[PDB]
């Protein structure tokens, strides 16, 4: 009864937290790729004397 309610509560909490953590990991991965592209743009800056003359 009280136990059924507590299991229900914990189950909703667990499911929401599961999906939040999935999204958090995806967010981390996208930020990593954005940083990689930013670094390539910095490299292109550094390499501009070779690309343009």
Author numbering: 445 to 497
Report text from the authors:
Rab11 family-interacting protein 2 (FIP2) is a 512-residue effector that contains a Rab-binding domain (RBD) at its C-terminus. The effector FIP2 contains an N-terminal C2 domain that binds to phospholipids (residues 15–102; Lindsay & McCaffrey, 2004), a myosin Vb-binding domain and a C-terminal RBD that binds to Rab11. The N-terminus of this modular effector family is variable and consists of domains that include EF-hands, ERM domains, C2 domains and myosin V-binding domains. These effectors regulate membrane trafficking following their recruitment to subcellular compartments by Rab11, Rab14 and Rab25 GTPases. The crystal structures of Rab11–FIP2, Rab11–FIP3 and Rab25–FIP2 complexes revealed that the RBD is a parallel α-helical coiled coil.
Here, the crystal structure of an uncomplexed form of FIP2 was determined at 2.3 Å resolution by the ab initio phasing method in ARCIMBOLDO. In contrast to previous crystal structures of complexes, the structure of isolated FIP2 reveals the formation of antiparallel α-helical dimers that are stabilized by polar interactions. Although the segment 439–512 was subjected to crystallization, a minimum of the first seven residues and the last 15 residues are dis­ordered. The polypeptides are of varying lengths depending on the extent of disorder at the N/C-termini. The structure reveals antiparallel α-helices that associate through polar interactions. These include a remarkable stack of arginine residues within a four-helix bundle in the crystal lattice. The distances between the Cζ atoms in the stacked guanidino side chains are 3.5–3.8 Å. Aspartate residues form salt bridges with these arginines and presumably contribute to orienting the guanidino groups (not shown). Since crystal formation required the presence of a small amount of Co2+, data were also collected at the Co2+ absorption edge. Also, FIP2 spontaneously forms dimers in solution at physiological pH. It is probable that parallel dimers dissociate to form the crystals observed here at pH 4.8. Therefore, the physiological relevance of the structure of uncomplexed FIP2 observed under these conditions is unknown.
